[PDB]
Amino acid sequence: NRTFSYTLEDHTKQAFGIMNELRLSQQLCDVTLQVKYQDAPAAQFMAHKVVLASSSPVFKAMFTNGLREQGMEVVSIEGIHPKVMERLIEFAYTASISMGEKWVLHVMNGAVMYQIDSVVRACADFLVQQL
């Protein structure tokens, strides 16, 4: 004759870890990102639409279009370097971006592009620190 709450704090961190494994194993993926940019060679990025939607309101609006795709959607991406997209996907799955000093401005360009608010601030705060 009572109500009982249990909350595992570490759950989301653990679940995103298994979600990262599935992406790396190319399991349960429904989006492929074909990233072409200037003279850099073309790259493919398999992911889960929901994980991308949860980290990017730009990706959220992109995949929520009513008439659901039967399986795998291919997406063309231009203006973002493939290394930048790789780090933004990694952020979406791991909660962390590690980046070379020379990449920060290009990372923020794609962060603004995909409205990844938190990494826009992280890059902007870093650039001001370099004076």
Next chain:
Amino acid sequence: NRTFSYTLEDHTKQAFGIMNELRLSQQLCDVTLQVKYQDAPAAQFMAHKVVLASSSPVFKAMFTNGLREQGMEVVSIEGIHPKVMERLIEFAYTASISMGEKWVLHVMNGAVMYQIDSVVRACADFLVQQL
């Protein structure tokens, strides 16, 4: 000429919140769970295979079968009460189970069934506390 890490701690909590909204709005869903149990009326549960996979190694093994389903898979579920499955899905998306005292044993039955390790322990520790 340096490497720079940024880590947003709250990211996974925030992303699971948007992931919960999408489930409740029935957006980007790829699994429906038709839960039938004894004399209880039948229920449908729309979810994302990856979120279910990340919280349950039983669901992970269920959906990782090579030949990917073109869109929406319907799953028949028996032996688990629909209120129990509702709370296990909610745990998978929110990291929390709130349950009536009279439900704990039935919750653990489904928690064992879907190998949700953390909620098995939470129920088992609760039942021992009631002597």
